[PDB]
């Protein structure tokens, strides 16, 4: 409950990282405000990371600037909440450094002296983020699942990390699982990766056991004591539809989704004691929607199984948000839409890992506020920490994570894509309501206002421009915040409306 200040270093990129070690870390005051007053967090390019300020309310205002005027009764989605994913590369990356460096980056996450992470994203056994390739029932033939067990990759690693992520946090963390493989017998082309589905069709022994994978999953993560809010139906199913896709896949055309869910994956999972486990479709790039939504959910066998539908960033250039996103959503407004996997660097020309890039960060919030804008619940980031080198990752397929391990200097970065991150995690809590928020005028921020739970406001400001904005928030129950948005700044603000 100290603050303690950004040790920041730099590695010749845009901005500094913060480095941490078994001794120190940066982080938060102790709680904290007063009326008439709004609380201001700040981060920069030029090295401010999430600080504290304060300022008044005015009555009045006047002038021809920016002004955001909130629209409280303007309500759209509850946000279920962030996070990002507990796989083996990240798990052996946290497990790398002494376990008093171990805690700071577990608290920097997932306490509330951090920055209040909800959500853990878990691979059901391998992905290309392992160093070895294993299903939970290798055993070749094995229908009824007789040999279905849990390796250490999750019995020591993921398991005993997850539990420490839970006892450090406040509010209570949701389990997100998505798995990337089935058992090579059960694939048309019996290999973990590669052009393949499961062999029949939905409805036959092979798709009845795939679904009862998925409890037995959920049976022995229940044994170690930790329980699901939600599971996919499978990681990027699109994947599996490509000739030589080099890494753990399963592909589905949405239609063979569709009726997997109708027959066999929704019927198991209502039937089970994992009833209230809830089903996310799609877990693949957001321009698949509408198309996809209307596949399976214009099918009542299925949509009466599907919760949501979950969504990628890495083509989000090639999908305008009101294209899909909105169109989705205004189409299908009872089924949520839900960000659940993203990172940077891992374009075949990318660099994987930037240490203190801060286009990175801002890439992460400009998605944040552009998916809540457009109707999503949460945002879930990939790797919760990797290597410098952007690993491990059994096919070399390294990208960057918002914390990097530096196992020969028991040392860990805080890059800004975390800071970008906390922004919002820290700030908005599960339950709170995206308002409305309009601008008097063209610019070039993003922003997005929210409403907490307890009727507080929030409000991100990014300014991915050179350019200082000065600007007014005007909510019509208190009054005016007069700020300024700095050239590549991002702020929220805070505020009580008592
Ligand atoms: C873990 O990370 C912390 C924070 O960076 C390290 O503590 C810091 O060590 C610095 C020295 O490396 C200290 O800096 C300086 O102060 C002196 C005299 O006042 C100046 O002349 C000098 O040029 C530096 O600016 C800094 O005060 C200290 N910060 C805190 C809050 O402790 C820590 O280093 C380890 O502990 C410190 C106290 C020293 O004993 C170090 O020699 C020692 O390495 C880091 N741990 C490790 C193992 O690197
Ligand atoms: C073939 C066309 C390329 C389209 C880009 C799709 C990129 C997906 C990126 N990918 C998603 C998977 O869920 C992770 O397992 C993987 O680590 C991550 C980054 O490669």
């Keep these: 409950e100290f603050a303690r200040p950004c040790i920041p270093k730099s590695f010749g990129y845009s901005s500094v990282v913060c480095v941490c070690n078994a001794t120190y870390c940066d982080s938060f005051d102790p709680p904290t405000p007063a009326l008439g007053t709004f609380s201001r967090y700040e981060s920069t390019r030029s090295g401010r990371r999430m600080e504290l300020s304060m300022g008044p309310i005015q009555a009045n205002h006047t002038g021809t600037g920016l002004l955001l005027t909130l629209q409280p009764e303007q309500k759209f989605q509850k946000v279920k909440g962030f996070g990002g994913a507990m796989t083996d590369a990240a798990a052996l990356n946290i497990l790398a450094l002494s376990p008093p460096a171990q805690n700071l980056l577990l608290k920097?996450?997932?306490?509330?002296?951090?920055?209040?992470?909800?959500?853990?994203?878990?691979?059901?056994?391998?992905?290309?983020?392992?160093?070895?390739?294993?299903?939970?029932?290798?055993?070749?033939?094995?229908?009824?699942?007789?040999?279905?067990?849990?390796?250490?990759?999750?019995?020591?690693?993921?398991?005993?990390?997850?539990?420490?992520?839970?006892?450090?946090?406040?509010?209570?963390?949701?389990?997100?699982?998505?798995?990337?493989?089935?058992?090579?017998?059960?694939?048309?082309?019996?290999?973990?990766?590669?052009?393949?589905?499961?062999?029949?069709?939905?409805?036959?022994?092979?798709?009845?056991?795939?679904?009862?994978?998925?409890?037995?999953?959920?049976?022995?993560?229940?044994?170690?004591?930790?329980?699901?809010?939600?599971?996919?139906?499978?990681?990027?199913?699109?994947?599996?539809?490509?000739?030589?896709?080099?890494?753990?896949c399963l592909g589905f055309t949405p239609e063979h989704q569709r009726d997997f869910i109708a027959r066999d994956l929704g019927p198991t999972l209502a039937n089970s004691?994992?009833?209230?486990?809830?089903?996310?479709?799609?877990?693949?790039?957001?321009?698949?929607?509408?198309?996809?939504?209307?596949?399976?959910?214009?099918?009542?066998?299925?949509?009466?199984?599907?919760?949501?539908?979950?969504?990628?960033?890495?083509?989000?250039?090639?999908?305008?948000?009101?294209?899909?996103?909105?169109?989705?959503?205004?189409?299908?407004?009872?089924?949520?839409?839900?960000?659940?996997?993203?990172?940077?660097?891992?374009?075949?020309?990318?660099?994987?890992?930037?240490?203190?890039?801060?286009?990175?960060?801002?890439?992460?919030?400009?998605?944040?506020?552009?998916?809540?804008?457009?109707?999503?619940?949460?945002?879930?980031?990939?790797?919760?920490?990797?290597?410098?080198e952007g690993g491990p990752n059994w096919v070399r397929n390294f990208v960057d994570s918002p914390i990097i391990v530096d196992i020969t200097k028991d040392t860990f970065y805080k890059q800004p894509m975390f800071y970008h991150l906390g922004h919002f995690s820290k700030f908005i809590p599960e339950g709170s309501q995206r308002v409305g928020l309009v601008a008097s005028q063209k610019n070039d921020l993003d922003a997005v206002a929210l409403m907490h739970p307890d009727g507080s406001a929030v409000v991100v400001v990014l300014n991915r421009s050179s350019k200082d904005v000065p600007l007014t928030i005007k909510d019509p129950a208190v009054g005016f915040l007069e700020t300024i948005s700095p050239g590549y700044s991002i702020h929220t603000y805070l505020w009580h409306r008592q």
């Design 273 to 388: 004691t994992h009833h209230n486990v809830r089903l996310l479709m799609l877990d693949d790039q957001r321009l698949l929607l509408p198309h996809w939504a209307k596949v399976v959910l214009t099918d009542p066998e299925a949509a009466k199984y599907v919760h949501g539908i979950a969504v990628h960033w890495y083509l989000d250039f090639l999908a305008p948000a009101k294209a899909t996103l909105g169109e989705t959503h205004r189409l299908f407004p009872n089924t949520m839409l839900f960000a659940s996997e993203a990172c940077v660097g891992s374009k075949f020309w990318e660099q994987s890992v930037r240490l203190g890039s801060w286009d990175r960060g801002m890439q992460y919030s400009h998605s944040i506020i552009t998916n809540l804008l457009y109707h999503v619940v949460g945002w879930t980031d990939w790797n919760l920490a990797l290597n410098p």
């Design 108 to 248: 920097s996450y997932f306490s509330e002296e951090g920055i209040g992470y909800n959500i853990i994203r878990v691979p059901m056994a391998s992905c290309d983020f392992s160093i070895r390739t294993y299903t939970y029932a290798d055993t070749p033939d094995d229908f009824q699942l007789h040999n279905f067990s849990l390796p250490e990759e999750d019995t020591k690693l993921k398991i005993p990390l997850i539990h420490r992520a839970l006892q450090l946090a406040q509010r209570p963390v949701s389990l997100l699982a998505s798995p990337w493989t089935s058992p090579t017998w059960l694939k048309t082309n019996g290999a973990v990766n590669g052009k393949g589905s499961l062999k029949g069709q939905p409805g036959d022994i092979y798709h009845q056991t795939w679904a009862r994978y998925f409890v037995k999953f959920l049976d022995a993560y229940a044994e170690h004591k930790l329980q699901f809010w939600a599971v996919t139906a499978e990681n990027e199913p699109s994947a599996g539809l490509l000739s030589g896709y080099p890494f753990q």
